[PDB]
Amino acid sequence: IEMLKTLPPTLREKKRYIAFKILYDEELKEGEVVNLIRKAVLEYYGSWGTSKANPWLVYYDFPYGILRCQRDNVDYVKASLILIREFKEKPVNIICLGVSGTIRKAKIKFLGIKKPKRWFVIRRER
Amino acid sequence: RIDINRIEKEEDIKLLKELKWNGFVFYQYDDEFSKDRYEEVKAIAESYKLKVYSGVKIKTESSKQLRDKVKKFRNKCHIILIEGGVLKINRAAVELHDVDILSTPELGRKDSGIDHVLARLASNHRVAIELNFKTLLNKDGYERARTLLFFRNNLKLAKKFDVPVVISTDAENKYQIKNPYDLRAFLNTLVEPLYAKKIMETAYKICDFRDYLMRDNVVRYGVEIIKEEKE
Amino acid sequence: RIDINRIEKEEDIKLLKELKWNGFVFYQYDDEFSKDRYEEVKAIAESYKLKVYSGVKIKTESSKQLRDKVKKFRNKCHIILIEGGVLKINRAAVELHDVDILSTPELGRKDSGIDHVLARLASNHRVAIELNFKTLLNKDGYERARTLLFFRNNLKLAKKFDVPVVISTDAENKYQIKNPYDLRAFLNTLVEPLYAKKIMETAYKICDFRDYLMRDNVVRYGVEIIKEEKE
RNA sequence: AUCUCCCCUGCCCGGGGUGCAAGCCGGUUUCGGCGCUUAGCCGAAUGUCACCGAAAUUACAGAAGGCGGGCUAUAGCCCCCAUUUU
RNA sequence: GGAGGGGGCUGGUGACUUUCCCCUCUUUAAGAGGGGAGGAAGUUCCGCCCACCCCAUUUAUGGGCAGCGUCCCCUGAGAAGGGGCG
RNA sequence: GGUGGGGUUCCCGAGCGGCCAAAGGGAGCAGACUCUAAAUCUGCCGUCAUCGACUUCGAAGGUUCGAAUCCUUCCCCCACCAC
RNA sequence: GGUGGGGUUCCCGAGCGGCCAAAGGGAGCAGACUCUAAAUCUGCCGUCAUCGACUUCGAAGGUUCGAAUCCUUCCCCCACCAC
């Protein structure tokens, strides 16, 4: 088996979760969102900043979305979100709602109302 | 928190109010302005819940005949903007000491934004520098590099001489507008967060001063109240 | 300043000596090593002005039968490297406490570089981590992002536990090699310049220790000099 | 040295077993609420800078119902003890 | 004066953001105020508050803890550390 | 956060405080066997590689006449838990 | 680093310490003129827009009965220089 232990929280990367929206009347696949956010995070950070602020999209079902960040550099990720201009025929709009430390709290502040827990049940049932 | 953009539809402005925005500026970049557009601005401002201050703008005309005609068209509206990469009109625009905010030193010039003598004259005449962002969203990579290099040079020349700075997106459509927290995080990314807050504070205070000037009988900051001897 | 690369021609190494480099390591990534290659290493090292230390390398074999055979082939050469993304062989490689430097946690794994238990066991057994750079020059953009994210994670896990780190380019051709000031400026760009100097100091001291160990009659750091009772 | 009894002294009386992911409620697979906080998360929040001071975010290192004892690893100053020394 | 061992302490004020969080509040929706990780949270060796299940309702019998400081033994540069109580 | 446990040869696994006592199995090498090979058996079995002797039972300290074992500490590896 | 100088109306340019003294030219507007237009002339010439009156001579302070002018300070604009 290939298993890696999670680092202790004094040594692990301090993270934040940015909740945002990709506003347009057009539609997107989540892989297109990952591709555009990788191109933009390169275009604003280089190798140095992308090693610095740790970008990874975690959720995109609706035009809303949730992405993970380092704690000291959420303003850098937001400035990376501003400089979207064009994707191959058209722009997309990226508009941030807020930022929190978890999904249950950022889900209820701007995104929705209830607090879901799906990772536990897909780990224990499957 | 005050934005500068043009009005196209009502749903866009209703989305603007629902986020953070308390007010903004309607942007007239033309030579044909009337009361019908300003009444439509009144209607869309009273549509949901807002207040909008309208301005006028000029580009590429004469040296100081333009200054007199700009004063004459400015006597009807609240605020004003003069844009142009020409240094010759820029000297007169910072010399006439009545323009509120100033834009476009980077795309019509492509050499450097503000001169040292220009920044010292702006300190004596108290004119503010307005930083646009639509220029960042219609360029290429090295063009973004040279443009943000010009903005960082102008940011230092405004920081050392205490020149007032107003950020805006200079938007044109429904989606060109961006968040105020985004612009604050970007100006935090550039140099400092306190100066980033000071830019928004100055952007509020300049419209507050123009409103308090053109609101009542105020001449060279003189307030006149009940039982006037006005002719 | 010690590099780790393979030898192809003499002009490349003559260019290496003319810049800054005082010595380097010849890299044998194969299972067929003889004395002819090492004599050619002697000839090219005595060609202009240099000293070269040769090593051997293994990849993708069994768990601890590989450990015994690796000790048996290591008893002929100076230093050694074991590369592999498998954690199962990595535990034995850091457990056997006789391997000098360790590489490849990032491209065979693509999940995370070093585990916390792995870093604590490396602290007890004193094995060093070698950071390659040819992996940076044969990937794409986000692959560079994930790889340097893994290197910054491993840099923290080596900084907090005082794990020795040796930088190298892991070169393969004439032009894959880079400057030592370049690698120092890059490790300065990542976290710190003092740790960047400490990496080069450790890279010199580990080869100095292996040379001082296999040079004379030294067993568990015991120096024996003139008029020996040696059988 | 180990194990079991009877010979003492003082104190205390419900005796065991599981443990908050215990246990209780709307629901009746699965979920939400109580336990739960002069910090109280749960896909695990407690952010950045400057400075008085010099005890300071620097080393070991992070809560998850709360309290008390013991063990392990060390950052800065203070106090105490020892070898070399003069 | 130099490697080392043991004991004590580990925060306060000011500025930014509710877009770091929670609570309270008024108000043309956003602001103001207060609070926000420690000697070990680690290790799980334990006990108590809190719950359920059985026997029993007993200081009659019986059960649990302790004999500390001191002393003894062992190893260290002989300060110090570990174990024990007739 | 919690309970019941395990770490011994290259891999799976036993082992009373005591003579490598270290059961072992599979593996490697060699012998034997066969036309060749499989299977069975024999010795080395980590080393010298004939008998025999020495080292390793996760690591350190301590008890003892003597530690895989008895005590303490440091670790890791399992199993299962949100409802 | 250095020398000789200049800043006055929308633009080129004069101006004794003194009555918008502010020469002016080009420009705008109006008149006159012409079938229309160019040219010439007339008034406003920055404002009230008939006479006439007020403001600005790069900015501040000071002298004076009174500053474009005289003094001081702060500036800018020219010209040319490495050999």
* Touch test A–B: 3 Cβ pairs or more under 8 Å: yes
Q: Tokens 């590989």 appear where?
A: C66
Whole-number Å distance between alpha carbons of C142 and A47:
8
Torsion of CA C71, C77, C81, C82, to 10 degrees: -30
* CB-CB neighbors (< 8 A) of C149 in chain A: 50-51, 54
Q: How far apart are CA B128 and CA B210, in angstroms?
A: 13
What crossing angle do the helices spanning B65-74 and B87-95 adopt, rounded to 10°?
50
- Which one-letter DSSP state was computed for residue C193? H
Distance A65 CA to D66 C1' (A): 39
* Resolution of the structure, angstroms: 4.3
Distance CA C79, CA A32 (A): 47
The residue type at B106: E
Q: Are B31 and B72 in contact (CB under 8 A)?
A: no
Cα–Cα distance measured from residue C42 to residue C28, given in angstroms and rounded to the nearest whole number:
15
CA dist B98 and A91 (Å) reads 38
Whether B140 contacts chain A with CB within 8 A: no
Evaluate whether B24 touches B16 at the Cβ level (below 8 Å): yes
Question: Strand B165-167 relative to strand B128-131: parallel, antiparallel, unpaired?
Answer: parallel
Rounded Cα gap, residues A30 and A65, in angstroms: 9
* A91 contact residues in B (CB cutoff 8 A): 175
Q: Which residues of chain A have a CB within 8 Å of the CB of B178? A: 82, 95
The CB density around residue C45, as the number of other CB atoms within 10 Å, is 20
Helix (H, G, I), strand (E, B) or coil at C194: helix
Number of H helices, E strands in chain A: 4, 4
Q: Do C148 and A47 touch (CB under 8 A)?
A: yes
Q: Which strand G nucleotides have any atom less than 7 A from protein CB atoms?
A: 10-11, 75-77
Confirm if B147 and B107 have CB atoms less than 8 A apart: yes
Spatial distance between the Cα atoms of C168 and C57, rounded to a whole number of angstroms: 15
C12 burial class (0-12, 13-18, 19+ CB within 10 angstroms)?
Answer: middle
User: Looking at chain C, which residue has its C-alpha nearest residue A47?
Assistant: C145
User: What strands, in cross-sheet order, belong to the sheet with C2-5?
Assistant: C2-5, C23-26, C52-59, C79-83, C101-103, C128-131, C165-167
> Which tokens is C231 given?
């059988």
CA-based nearest distance A15→chain C, Å: 14
Q: Check whether residue B17 has its CB closer than 7 Å to nucleic acid strand E.
A: yes
**Cα B137 to the center of its chain, rounded Å:** 18
How many C-beta atoms surround the C-beta of residue A87 within 10 A? 16
Considering only CA atoms, which of B130, B115, B225, B140 is closest in space to residue B170?
B130
Q: Is C15 helix (H, G, I), strand (E, B) or coil?
A: helix
Distance B122 CA to G24 C1' (A): 34
Give the angle C19-C24-C25 at the CA atoms, nearest 5°.
155
Strand partners, B167: B131
Q: Do chains B and C touch (3 or more CB pairs under 8 A)?
A: no
Of B153, B149, B176, B178, nearest to B163 by C-alpha is B153
Task: State phi, psi for C159 to the nearest 5 degrees.
Answer: -75, -40
Longest dimension (CA), chain A: 45
Which tokens in the block code for residue B72?
């004459």
Angle between helices A74-82 and B180-190 (to 10 degrees): 110
CB C24 within 8 A of CB C16: yes
Q: Is the dihedral of CA B93, B99, B104, B105 positive or negative?
A: positive
Residues 6+ away with beta carbon under 8 Å from C168: C3, C4, C5, C25, C130, C131, C132, C133, C203
**Experiment type:** cryo-EM
Contact between C169 and C175 under an 8 Å Cβ cutoff? The reply is no
* Sheet of A93-100, strands arranged across: A56-59, A64-70, A15-23, A93-100
Beta pairing, strands C79-83 & C52-59: parallel
B170, amino acid identity: D
Report H helices in C60-177: 65-74, 87-95, 116-125, 141-159
Q: Is the dihedral of CA C63, C68, C69, C74 positive or negative?
A: positive
Instruction: State whether B189 and A79 contact (CB < 8 Å).
Output: yes
- B128 DSSP β-pair partners: B101
Q: Are C52 and C10 in contact (CB under 8 A)?
A: no
Task: Indicate the helix (H) or strand (E) that contains A125.
Answer: helix A119-125
d(CA B175, CA B7): 12
Query: Alpha carbon C153 to chain centroid distance?
Result: 19
List CB contacts of C46: < 8 A, sequence separation 6 or more: none
DSSP assignment of C46-87 equals TTTT--EEEEEEEES--SSHHHHHHHHHHTTSSEEEEE-S-H
For B179, the token pair is 């968040």
Of B133, B141, B182, the CB nearest to A78: B182
Residue corresponding to tokens 């000839």: C43
Sequence length of chain B is: 231
Element (H, E) at C209: helix C193-215
Dig out the tokens for C209 from the structure: 């220790």
Query: Nearest-CA residue of chain C relative to A55?
Result: C145
- A82, A85, A95 ranked by CB distance to B186: nearest: A82
Picking from C214, C220, C207, the residue whose alpha carbon sits closest to that of residue C23 is: C207
Neighbours of B145 (CB within 10 A): 11
Q: Which two tokens stand for residue B208?
A: 């507050």
Residue B194 beta carbon within 7 A of nucleic strand E:
yes
Alpha carbon distance B53, B56 (integer Å): 11
CB B24 within 8 A of CB B5: yes
Please name the residues in contact with C143: beta carbons below 8 A apart, sequence gap of 6 or more: none
Q: Are A99 and A42 a contacting pair, CB within 8 Å? A: no
CB neighbour list of residue A108: distance below 8 Å, 6 or more residues apart: A114, A115
Q: Residue A96 in 3-state DSSP?
A: strand
How far is it, in rounded angstroms, from Cα C78 to Cα C23? 15
Nearest C-alpha of chain B: how many angstroms from A78? 6
B181 touches strand E (CB under 7 A): yes
Any chain A CB within 8 A of the CB of B136? yes
- Residues A117, A108 contacting (CB under 8 angstroms): no
Say whether residue A109 is in contact with chain B using an 8 A CB cutoff: no
Sequence-ordered alpha helix ranges (H) in B160-192: 180-190
How far, in Å, CA of C155 to CA of C151, rounded? 6
The letter for the amino acid at C118 is: L
